Design a protein around this ligand. Structure first.
Ligand code: FGD
Length: 267
């Protein structure tokens, strides 16, 4: 079992409506999280034979009022009979899933961006990331929506540099026709379907473009080079953003992460 560690910013999961039902196609669909899908994968398939999920790290901090607002619907820990990112009772490999939550808070965000304290903290948070994976002996790490950008953890000769991966909601190949890199990838995919691309995001300035009707998800290295790729999400012009996210999560993302891990295991 290639020891697996998972990282995500809880605030990012709330935005995406993770663990919530969303109206889709005129009715509703449950917006399953990336972790829930992985938990199901580890439980019901041979992928489970290859890995043990060891820790589920999240970086949010309760002392950041913006971090608080962002998960108001969820809350930092599970409330009784209330909304949660997955069912509070979920089990992964005979381990209560909730029991694996870890916070390695990026508190450094309290200080202003670029300030010496902000930077000194960011390094220590990355330093704290490294340290506790090791506390978990993690053989492998997945990032799903972790908002901090790791520049130091993916250093030359650091113990997890090639063992650290991000699942991204779009293709990431340089010369790929459907490449949808960045934090705007889901929205770039929805607007590309309209044959329109956004020139300036603040004021929604746009431009005509050849329609693209497909998107996918990338399981790539973080230092990152693509290790496994899927592109199975047809995109429709009348599609909403909630529909596109779910479909890419269901058509291409869950598969890429699992196939990527499966392949990644004999390495
Ligand atoms: N169903 C439902 N629909 C939604 O749309 C929905 C939307 C949200 C987004 N919440 C946010 C709260 C605060 C910020 C922020 O950045 N604040 C900073 C710091 C000062 C402060 O902490 O206030 C600022 O003011 O500059 C951003 C987002 C949360 C639940 C939601 N639930």
């Amino acid at each position: 079992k290639r020891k697996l560690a998972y990282i995500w910013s809880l605030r990012n999961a709330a935005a995406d409506k993770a663990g919530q039902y969303v109206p889709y196609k005129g009715e509703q669909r449950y917006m399953k999280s990336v972790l829930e899908s992985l938990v199901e994968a580890l439980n019901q398939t041979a992928l489970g034979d290859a890995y043990e999920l060891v820790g589920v790290i999240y970086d949010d901090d309760a002392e950041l009022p913006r971090d608080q607002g962002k998960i108001k619907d969820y809350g930092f820990a599970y409330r009784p009979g209330q909304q949660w990112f997955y069912p509070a009772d979920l089990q992964v490999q005979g381990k209560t899933l909730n029991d694996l939550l870890l916070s390695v808070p990026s508190t450094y965000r309290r200080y202003p961006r670029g300030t010496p304290e902000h930077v000194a903290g960011k390094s220590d948070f990355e330093r704290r990331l490294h340290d506790t994976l090791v506390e978990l002996g993690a053989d492998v790490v997945v990032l799903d929506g972790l908002l901090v950008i790791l520049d130091e953890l993916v250093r030359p000769g650091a113990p997890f540099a090639r063992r650290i991966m991000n699942i991204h909601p779009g293709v990431t190949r340089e010369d790929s026709p459907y490449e949808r890199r960045g934090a705007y990838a889901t929205l770039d995919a929805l607007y590309g379907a309209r044959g329109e691309k956004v020139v300036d995001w603040a004021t929604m300035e746009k431009v005509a473009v050849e329609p693209l009707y497909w998107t996918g998800a990338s399981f790539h290295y973080v230092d990152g080079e693509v290790f496994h790729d899927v592109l199975k999400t047809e995109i429709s012009p009348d599609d909403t953003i909630l529909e596109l996210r779910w479909n890419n999560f269901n058509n291409s993302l869950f598969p890429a992460l699992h196939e990527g891990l499966a392949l990644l295991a004999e390495k």
